[PDB]
């Protein structure tokens, strides 16, 4: 059974945090993957993007580890990417799933043009970078689909982006940097200050302040 | 470096006659059979997602 180790975990387990958006609003670190399992555990789908063997030379031969890149996310605005290196492939994949759950970020979705219906594309052009790989996401008309390489396409579909134009520069052959760059571009959607986000922010009690006595009695 | 051996392996390969089998469906029927084999039949699946021509 889940025994929370952090204050956030204890608050989540006792139904005091009503949504994952309350954690994102205060930008609290999520150190327990069981929080994500609680909030989204029925709709998350994880995909092993890659298993990559890495070798360290020693006095006698190469010690080999396997690095699992795993993309996770429900297809309605949440996505994460996790990389874990371990001696065995299975435990590397287990750790990568855990790390992808821990790194799940919200995805802001917008409209290319007229604003009928649910948001379908990125709110604006956003670029993400990782180690000489630059991935640019551009809003696309409804029904376009993801015009991208397979690796960014996986993460964009997992994030609930229905249609998006993609540009990529650099050594995209290195799947890890490509995936990290598109994850960065996706996570920059909610950091972009658009004029609808100009309204002054109304501050709310943080979960640690709101449910303080609950944690005090614990 | 000699041209004396030019059809060696194909020449010495034992000859096996092709077996007689019923004709393969063509056109729309073949696509119907493929669709049924891939999306209406689930018994071959065992959870491993093995290939369609697996031999082990």
């Amino acid at each position: 059974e889940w025994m929370p180790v952090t204050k956030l975990g204890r608050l989540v387990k006792d139904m005091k945090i009503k949504s994952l958006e309350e954690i994102y609003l205060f930008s609290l670190p999520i150190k327990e993957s069981e929080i994500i399992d609680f909030f989204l555990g029925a709709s998350l789908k994880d995909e092993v993007l890659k298993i990559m063997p890495v070798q360290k030379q020693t006095r006698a031969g190469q010690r080999t580890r396997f690095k699992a890149f795993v993309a996770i996310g429900d297809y309605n605005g949440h996505v994460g990417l996790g990389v874990k290196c371990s001696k065995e492939v299975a435990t590397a994949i287990r750790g990568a799933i855990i790390l992808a759950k821990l790194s799940i970020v919200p995805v802001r979705r917008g409209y290319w043009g007229n604003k009928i219906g649910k948001p379908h594309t990125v709110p604006c052009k956003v670029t993400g970078r990782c180690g000489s790989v630059l991935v640019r996401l551009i809003p696309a008309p409804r029904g376009t689909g993801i015009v991208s390489a397979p690796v960014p396409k996986k993460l964009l579909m997992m994030a609930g982006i229905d249609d998006c134009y993609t540009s990529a520069r650099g050594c995209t052959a290195t799947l890890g940097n490509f995936a990290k760059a598109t994850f960065d571009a996706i996570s920059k959607t909610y950091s972009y200050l658009t004029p609808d986000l100009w309204k002054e922010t109304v501050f709310t009690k943080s979960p640690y302040q709101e449910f303080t006595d609950h944690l005090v009695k614990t | 470096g000699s041209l004396a051996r030019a059809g060696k392996v194909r020449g010495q390969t034992p000859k096996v006659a092709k077996q007689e089998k019923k004709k393969k469906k063509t056109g729309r029927a073949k696509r119907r059979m493929q669709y049924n084999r891939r999306f209406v039949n689930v018994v071959p699946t065992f959870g491993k997602k093995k290939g369609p021509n697996a031999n082990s």
């Binding site: 063997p53 | 491993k48 290939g51 082990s56």
Partner: peptide, 30 residues
């Protein structure tokens, strides 16, 4: 035969690509 095991052993051999493909088949898809 477990394809995770086959990939662990034979990834650097002549059949590295094949065991990688089999591992990817098992990992995602069901």
């Amino acid at each position: 035969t477990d394809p995770i095991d086959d990939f662990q052993v034979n990834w650097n051999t002549k059949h590295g690509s094949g065991v990688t493909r089999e591992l990817m088949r098992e990992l995602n898809g069901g």
